[PDB]
Structures are given as structure tokens and as C-alpha cells.
């Protein structure tokens, strides 16, 4: 039994959860009301996969999900939407104000009195599992709730459960476009907790998705639904290894064993290669080599950073559909001989390969074409530091004058935390700088049997 | 009565074992349900080597299946030969090792090893006169390498006079499907060098090369590679099951092939291979089998035998053939390629002949070579291992499960000694100084 | 590094009570560095003969000419090897023989402490030389350990606990070693005698046709020896460290002699394997010494 | 082991051997010489007269005389069987001059330690070549001494 618990905090978290659960209900043949007519027609099967859904005696299937947010509107929407009967009515929404883009409000002042309910419901969900795998936490940096409340949650889960893997999906402020003025402060603050308590945090930017949607899918006016659908597709690709049979299966422990060199380096980038509209789905082969090459291209990166400016430390490839190992073997051999892709000299192997037989599904009303083959790449590299370095500058420009600081201090924080935070982000970048350097000389190669 | 107990751990070992049992069941004419529907009489003469007898003339193999995740057990049970195995031998846990050697050998495997050993003892005590064991596994993974080495250690401690074999899939030079492979391969070879009498080295790259070039397959899949390996496994132990003109048990191959105790890493091979649609052009005779058998491109070890010297060779033939042809061909092979055979062994080719060839092949042969070129594999692993150990690439995942750095070093030393020992009997003269 | 100067010695003991009771005959005859032996059942063809670096005739106890006295053999071997030890280099003694031949004797000596074997002479010269040499500007440390090899498993003798197997390891700089191997300090040779007796009581022994008490396992008695200097400077350092390994080898075995089945044959087989490996390494070392 | 025990138990009765010695060039084992050398002691002390044959020689005889290019062990075994039958024929059937088993030993071994004779059979000839030839007594006697027929 391979179960895993989904947590959704903040507005970005719950919209991503909406797209996710739509996709999963479509994958498992589950109606929006929770009934599955496939088993009734066939007479029985394993289609009620226990990973995300728990099956009751009456035949209903409830999701192993816990939504949380301080604004009732974004979840009053889903309490009266199409999927109002899918979710358990205990949703843990606070009937109060919101963090108001304030880490201190979400962590110290309003974060209390709601934390307890969330841990009891997570305990109740965990008690129903036999051999729980881990947590998938969805939230967004920059938001008051998604930063502070997520930090408090992460701390309490680390104290309680400890050994369970706790993966994170997050939305970083973009270089240029932004939706708020105090994004850097909340980022610099939650980095200290996402560094220690998370085990592997996946990292996504909005501008990259906008460029990908404009270029490949030919959508000139994208909205948040398309972004959430792409993220949901990625999470499906990650989790499909423990829901369907495959030639080479990759569990959630193999991820961390294969993608995290040192304990403080767990910030991979994510990519989905065959993103293409229905019209352009023709006139192309979409062979395994094509999608494998398209993963590595800088343009298809889902965070605004150039891989060519760093060095690759690890890569995980997860294929879906009609894929045989020899094509992946040839594609890896072709990539290893390219000179624009540099691998560090302390990882001669470099790659992890996983293959799954279930092909990707097509959401009605979506934009992604039906394809026979798909691949998702998760690459741990040093270029990510650049994406951090930019934001830091803005925070210092904001901190040198002490702008907007009385709001944070009034909610119960002090100035040294802002100070302590900068130091923490300052170091992490140092570590990313050290791991990228080549070996020195070995300090050896002495003479010997010179006789 | 020479009984063999078969064990298999990990995904790779389970898949290879499934294909192997399908092949052997075809050889002896056992239906998937377990009943006998063969034609010849000799098939039941020695069925007790691999099978036990149930009540209603139903046979059940001696397989023991081990893993730390239920996915592969479910896959094997829901298969063409799922119901042939005994249900009580499906030993498994949950939350598998996850490509982590320490989890497999020191933390998670320590709980399942007791149950696995109980089943092994139960199966072994019922045999009339046990000869040896087997174990199919892969070194690049967690469950396979870890649990296999632990099982080998415990069983060798318990039964010290029987013959332990193993068919191990080594990491490949180029094609790689894990990133932490060298640690697992090294910390393991460290145990296989100590606790095993024979090891046969398999590599994915060589098998892919055979499929692409010899068999001319356009879309090889893992079923084919399992096929090749299973054919070899069946070929090795033929003389225990069928009569012949010159027999060779596992122990005779052990005695003749191994000069010194720590040199027991073999390169296997099988002939012939017509690739289909080319059978009508190739005439099948003993010289043709010997020609294809010694070819450098037929091996499944991904080592070039021309870069070293053959310490010893063994050829097991299956069919009706003349002994003069076999002896003359082996002599000619020895003489014409004298540079590639060591000089201080006057004759280094064991030969055996069996009378019952495979399903649809007038003749067949299998090859077990022992040469110094295999050292290259170990050297390559070392050339990766240290490159990841100088800067401690992925070490914290291993030390978090209780393993002192010293264990890593005590091993890189052991494999390096193995390479040096093979390198000694490699130069084609030794005099002057 | 130093040349592998291996010294081969053989020694003939006198008669025992049982042999004296029977009308036995002596067959070993020595001359110079050559010893010859005859067949009672085949006295026609020829004696067989061997040559060794040292041949010792301790057959006739009251003999005065060419008698191999224990002080003589100690001067031959132990004095020079203790001198080598004090230079800071390692020393190894191997005692070999079959029940009766007279191994223990050469290693220990008589019980009246009047004619001393290799062990008392070496240890007393070590202790005495130091006691009559140490000064304010030097310090000396001596420790002892005692282990056995049985069926390729290491077992401890000094420790009286349950005799579980220990685990050999390989410290990267210091070489092979054994975990949880008891090590104790000693002050004089009486302490070494007490520890040696206590350990010898714990050795595994089994009866056979040849003798009622036959060694079924090898034993190693290690003496760790350390010298520390106090120079006219704040930096106080250890000059060097040396080890003395006094080793007891079990005799070669043949089912044509020990007809027991089961564990007894297995122990003999393992013993023979170990002896063959030991001879293989020792001869190679001598060749290494000889070549250059 | 068996010859040792038989020599102890019976003693005075004769003991003959027919053994396959290793060939100079071809062999089906790598550890053959150790076994042969270890066997030679008991072959020497206990047996009273030992005959030796070689598979390579019989292969050459089959190729040259019977024109069988791909012989197997059955043909070699048949030839050895003919040899032994000719040895023992004198005990069974009538004849002008009869030779017992002990007469072989009395006439063939000079000293106790040199009891290793070779054996040969002259008229090995195929059916097709059985014609075109007389096969008289002198011809077969001459053929017995030919070095190629050993
Ligand atoms: C000429 C003919 O009749 O067809 C052959 C054939 O074309 C060849 C190419 C066969 C064929 O093998 C393959 O195509 C193949 C594919 C992937 C991996 C390995 C082999 C054959 O499939 C394989 C099959 O071999 C057997 O049936 C043997 O008994 C073999 N057993 C199995 O293959 C087997 C597999 C699964 C279940 C049960 C049996 C065997 C050999 C030695 C010891 C034990 C078993 C045969 C005769 C052939 C075909 C059908 C084309 C070859 O295989 C064997 C083992 O015989 C490939 O090299 C040989 C040479 C043959 O000429
Ligand atoms: N990709 C994507 N990003 C989103 C989505 N919704 C919100 N965001 C991001 O979220 C950021 C705003 O912070 P939020 O996470 O919404 O903070 P919050 O949930 O409103 O919590 P409070 O600030 O306390 O009200 C914006 O900058 C967006 O980039 C979404 O649906 N998709
Ligand atoms: N060279 C010698 N001179 C005088 N007495 C000796 C001599 N060698 C041995 N002895 C004595 O004669 C006996 C023979 O020694 P013994 O204790 O039987 O040794 P062992 O049984 O041969 N030892 P081992 O080979 O390890 O089994 C003992 O009483 C010795 O003290
Ligand atoms: N020959 C062969 N090798 C395989 C097969 N499946 C996986 N492998 C190899 O096994 C390695 C991974 O080992 P794995 O099975 O995960 O070890 P485990 O997790 O302990 O069972 C990969 O590098 C593959 O090359 C197979 O069907 N055949
Ligand atoms: Mg909000």
C-alpha cells in the first residue's frame, strides 16, 4: 500500500489542488460525485487506487487531501463548485482575516488557533494509512499565508513525524513581473524554514510558464488555469510510478537518494517536454530522442535561469507511455556527448531513468494534445543560485532604508530575524558556489618503482 | 540426487527468475497449472533436481522470491506462470530500500532476513542430498545487492560444504539507470569476493549489442535479455538432468575453472544464434559452434578477451556429435590463438557432452570463460567510485543508516587487490626481473 | 623495509616414557647442516635427507659434545631478533610440530625453570635489559594480547566471556586488526606467565588416535612494545613502536592418521589450507629477498 | 583404495588392468596430470600387469584403417573389447597351444617393477577393403610391429 498525503495552503496552493484533483479524478475514472461506475460495470478491480483516494463501504471514494486557507472566498468557491461532494466537509478554513502579505501575521499572530485543527486532521488522515510514503505540500512564496503558515506547518510536521519524506511544490517571485510589493521579505523569511524542514522542494516560476504557453501552445492570453494544469501534469508524472505498472519504477525514496547530493542542496528544477498544441501535434514524430532533447533546452525550463551558466549535478527522467529502454539509452548517450551540457566531474554516472506504461491523459477543455509518449525531467543544478541572487538584491534595497518594516514588527517579530534571514540566504548561495568547483588536483600522483 | 535451491531477490532477479522458470517448465513439459503433459520419457527421470512433488501428480518448483516492495510480487503472480509457484514462498515487506545499500543490508533487510532464512531452511531440509544454491540479483540496486549479499553470507555460514552460485548483472560502462551505482557495486563486490564459489558476470551493454548486431532485433526489450540469460542458466546445469557421454556437475566446473580461491568471476556465452531468416544459409556443425562460441562479440560480459589471457575455459555441448571433432576443435582453438592462453597451465579447456539438445536445435553449446580481461570492469568501477568519494557525493544517505566511513575504504582496498591479483597472471612472459 | 631473512631450524628431542618403555630405535642422524632419516619397513633402498639452516641435536640429555642447549638456540635466534625488535621493527616466531616431536618444550621449557625455552629468555632479557637501562629521559611501554584462529574465525582467550566470533577489519593507515580484542599491560614475566596460562586453558582441544590432546587451532601471542623519548624540548614524542608475534601452528593432518568423521575432518582440512597458504607466502618472501 | 584392499585380502591372485592413459595433446580435463601421477603409485605396487591405451592413437587408427572420419567412444570401446576377448580366449575355447593368465606374467615381465606392456591388434580393416587383400599370417604379423598401428 503506497499512500501519500496532499496538503494545499494559500490561494495558489488550492487552485493547484483544484487542477490536480480534476486530473486525478479523470485518471481514475472517478465521477465528480465520488462514485466509480467502472467497477460496477466490470464487477471489481484495483481502479480505486489507494494512493490518493480512500474507499468507504458504500463505494464512495474520498481524497487524502487537507485544504487550508485564511480567506473563505477561495474555498467557498470549491464548497459550491462541481466537486463540492468529492471533498470531506471538514476543510479547516478560518472565519477571520488573512495574513495580508505578512509573514509575521501568518506565523505568530493569526497562525495560532488554526494550527491545532490542521494537525488533528492530518493525524486522522495518517492513522488511516498503512505504510505512508510522505507529504506533498503545495503553497507559494511571497504570500503571507503560503509562507508563514507553511513554515509553521513544516516545523510542526518535522517535530511530529520526522522520518517521512515531505516534498514541496512552490511558486517563486519572478525576476520582472510581480503581484505584490513585499514579496522579497516573505521569500527571504520562509527560505530559512524551507531549507531545514523540507526534504526536496520543487521550484516553479510564472514567467517561464507564460513563455512556454505562448511559444509552444500558441495561447496568446493564458490564465492561471493553464499554469495549474501544467503543474498538475508534472505532479502526476512524479507520482505515477507508484500507481501503475512499469518496466523501471521509481519510488519517492529513490528520488531523494538519487537527486540530493548534500543535505542543503535540495532545490531541483522541473520540466515537461512534449508541451504542444493539437494543431502542431501533427507534422512531428515525438520520438523518445526528440522529447529527451527538448527537456534539456534552456527555453523549456520552468524557472527563469540558464542551465548553460552552471553545472548539472543530478538528473531524473520519468517517461510515460510507449517507451522502450533502448531509445532512452541512445538518447542519454547522445546527450552525454554534447559539449553545451556540462556535468560535474564528481558524478560520472549522472542520470536516473524511470519508465511507466500508463500514457498521459487529456483533460476535456484543456490545451495539451493527446500523445503516445511523454517525459518529465527533474534536474539538480547550480544555475538555480542565479535565480536567488536577483531577489536578494531587491530585499537589500528594501532593507537599507527599513521600508514596510513596522507592519512585520507590529505582528510580533523583531528586526534581527530580517537580519538573521539575509545571513542564511547568504550562506546557502556560498554552498552552491563551492559544490560547483572542479576537483583540485587529487594531491597525489607520486613516483614509485623507479628501479 | 543433486538438488538445487533457487533464490531470487530484487526486481531484476525476479524478472529473470520468472523467465527462467518458464523456460525450464517448457524443457520438462510442465503446464502452467503444474501438471505434466510431455512426450518423452527422460523428462521425469530427474525432475526432482528443480521440482518437488505435490499430491495429485502436480509439481512445484523450489523458487524463493524476495523483495522489499509488493509491486513485483503482484506482477509475477498476475502472469502466465503465476500460479506454478508456492504461495508460502512469496516473502516481502513494504517501503523498499530505494537504491540505498545500507537500507537493504543493515536496516530494512535485517527484519526480513529471519523469515527468508526460515523458508530457506524449510525447503533445504526436505531435499535428499543438496548440491548447491543459486541467486539472481543486480548489484546496482539496493534490495538486490544488499539482501543478496546478506543472504549469501548467512547461508554460507550455515551450510559450508555445498556450492554457492550467483548470476549478477554488473553496472555497464555507458548505459546507466542509477546515479549512486558505484557505491552499491563496490560495497557489494566486497562480499561476493569472499562468500561465493562461482560468479557469472552479465552486463546490459553486451546483451544489447548481441540483440542489435547478431539477432538483428529492431526493438529489443528486457524479455529478450532475460531470454539470453535464461538460456545460459539452463545450459550450465544440463548434465545433472540428462544423460550423456561425458558428464560435468557444478562441482567439476568449480574444480577445473578456479586456480586460486579468489579468482572465480566468469564470462558466460551461448551458441548458436541464427537471427532467424538466416538459418537456411548457415549450416550447423560442431566447428561452426566452436567458431561462434569463442568470438569476442558473442560474450555477455562487455569485456574484450583479446586484451588479456584466458586462465581457463569450459565448453558444455548438448546434442549428438563425435568426440574426435570436439577434441580436435578445442586443440585447434588452443594452438591458433596461443598468445591468449596462459603458458603455465599445459591444457586449459574443459569439455563436456550431453545427449539431449534443447527444444528445436539439433545442437547447442554453452561457454564459461575465466580470463584476466574481466579486471577492466572492476577498474572502471574504481575509476568512478573514488571520483565520487573524494568529495563525498551522496554519503549522508549511507551514514544516516549506521555505516562508518571505514567500511567504504576497507572495500575499495579489497577490489583493488583483486585487480592487482588478476594483473599478475596477465603478462605473456615473466623473467629477467 | 628490510630483507626477508628467514631462518629455518629443526630440533630433535630425546625419548619419552612410552618410547623408552618400548624397544624403539632412533632414525634421525645429523651432520653439519643435513639430517637423514630411514624407513623401518624399507631398509634396503636409501635414507631420505634434508638440509636446513640450523640442525639441533637435543637427543642425548647428558651429552657434552654438539649438544643443542637452550641457551645456545636462544643465542642463535632470540638475541638477534630482540636486537632487531629494539631497532623498532617487527619480529615473528613460528613454532611448528606434531604431538610428541616437542614444540611446547622449545617454546616454553621445563617446569623447574632451570632450562628456559624461547619465551622466558626473550621476555626476561627484554624486561631486565629495560629495567637496567631506563632513565629520566625515556619511557617504555609493554602490552600483551592473545588470540586464536579456528575454522577461519578469530576468538579471544584472555577475555572469559562467551566465546563469540570477533570481526577482522583494516584501519587504512595501521593495517589489519580485530575489534574488541582484549589488550592488557604487563610489568614482569610473572604477569605474562599468568596471562599465558589463563589463555592456554581456554584453547580448543580435541582427542585423536595420535594423542588425547591435539591442537585444533592456531594461536597468536602479540607483545606490543613502545618507546617514548623526553628530549630537551617541550615536544615529547614516541620514538617508534614494534610488535613481537609468538605464534603456535597446529600440526599437519591426514585422515590416514585421524580417522574421525564430521567436524574432525573439517578442522583438519581448514588447518591444511591455512598451512599451505602460510608456506606459499613465506617462500615468496624468501624469493623476494634473494632476487635483488 | 579398492586395489589396496584387494591386495590385503586376497594377495596371491593375479590382478590385471586395462586403463586409458592421458593423451600427449588432447584431453578433456585440466587437472589430469595430478590424478595420473597420484595414481601411479598404486598402479605400481599392487597391480601385477597393467596395459595402457590412448584415445588419440585409437582415433588415428580409426581414421586411417576403417575410414571413419567422425568416430565416437563406441568404436574405441569395441576395439578394446576385442583386445580383451583375444586375451581371455585361451581359457574358454579349445586350441593347439593354450596360454593361461599366469603364463602371460611368467613370460612377459622380467622384473617386478616393469610390468607395463603395450597391446596391438593387426587386422583392423573395413568391410570394403576386406577384399583386395589376402590377410595371411605373415601380413598380420608384420602389421603388428608397424609403429603406426600402436
Ligand atoms: C532454428 C529454430 O528452430 O529457431 C530458433 C532460432 O532461430 C534461434 C535464432 C534461437 C531463437 O532465440 C531468439 O530469437 C532469442 C531472442 C532473445 C534472446 C535469446 C534468443 C528462438 O527464439 C529460441 C528457440 O530455442 C529454443 O527453443 C531452445 O530450446 C531454448 N529455449 C528457449 O528459447 C525458450 C524460451 C522461453 C521458454 C522456453 C524455451 C534453450 C536453449 C538452451 C537451453 C535451454 C533452452 C529456437 C529453437 C529458435 C527460436 C524460436 C527462433 C536462439 O535462441 C535459442 C536459445 O535457441 C537465438 O540464438 C539461438 C539460435 C537459434 O537458431
Ligand atoms: N501559477 C499560479 N500562481 C498563483 C496562482 N494563484 C496565485 N498565484 C501566485 O500567488 C501570489 C500571491 O500570493 P498568494 O499565494 O496568493 O498569497 P495568499 O494565498 O493570497 O495569502 P495572503 O497573502 O495572506 O492573502 C501571486 O504573486 C501569484 O504569482 C495560480 O493559480 N497559479
Ligand atoms: N629438544 C628437547 N630436549 C629435551 N626435551 C625435549 C625436547 N623437545 C621436547 N622435549 C620434551 O619432550 C616432550 C615432547 O614435547 P611435547 O610437549 O610432546 O610437544 P608436542 O606435543 O610435540 N607439541 P605440538 O607439536 O604443538 O603438538 C615434552 O615433555 C618436552 O618438554
Ligand atoms: N538484465 C536485466 N537487467 C535489469 C532488468 N530490470 C532492471 N535491470 C537492471 O537493474 C538495475 C536496477 O536494479 P534494481 O532491479 O532496481 O535493483 P533492486 O531495486 O534491488 O531490485 C538497472 O541498472 C538495470 O540495468 C531486467 O529485466 N533485465
Ligand atoms: Mg491569501
Numbering used by the authors:
A (entry chain S): 1 to 451
B (entry chain I): 1 to 433
C (entry chain N): 1 to 292
D (entry chain E): 152 to 301
Paper text:
KIF1A, a key member of the kinesin-3 family, is recognized for its high processivity and fast MT plus-end-directed motility. These attributes are crucial for the long-distance transport of cargoes in neurons. Mutations in the microtubule-associated motor protein KIF1A lead to severe neurological conditions known as KIF1A-associated neurological disorders (KAND). Here, we present 2.7-3.5 Å resolution structures of dimeric microtubule-bound KIF1A, including the pathogenic P305L mutant, across various nucleotide states.
To advance structure-based drug development, we determined high-resolution structures of KIF1A harboring the KAND-associated P305L mutation in complex with MTs, using the same nucleotide conditions as those for MT-bound WT KIF1A. Weak densities corresponding to α- and/or β-tubulin tails connecting to the motor domain were detected in all nucleotide states, suggesting that the P305L mutation does not prevent interactions between the K-loop and the α and β-tubulin tails. P305 is a key component of the MT-binding interface, located within the highly conserved loop-12 motif, (PYRD/E), which forms a 310-helix in various kinesins, including KIF1A90. The integrity of the 310-helix remains intact, with most changes occurring towards the N-terminal side of the mutation. On the other hand, the five best AF2 models of WT KIF1A more closely resemble the MT-bound structures in this area. These predictions, along with the conformational changes observed in the MT-bound structures, indicate that the P305L mutation induces loop-12 conformations that are suboptimal for MT binding, thereby shifting the equilibrium towards the MT-unbound (or weakly-bound) states, as observed here.
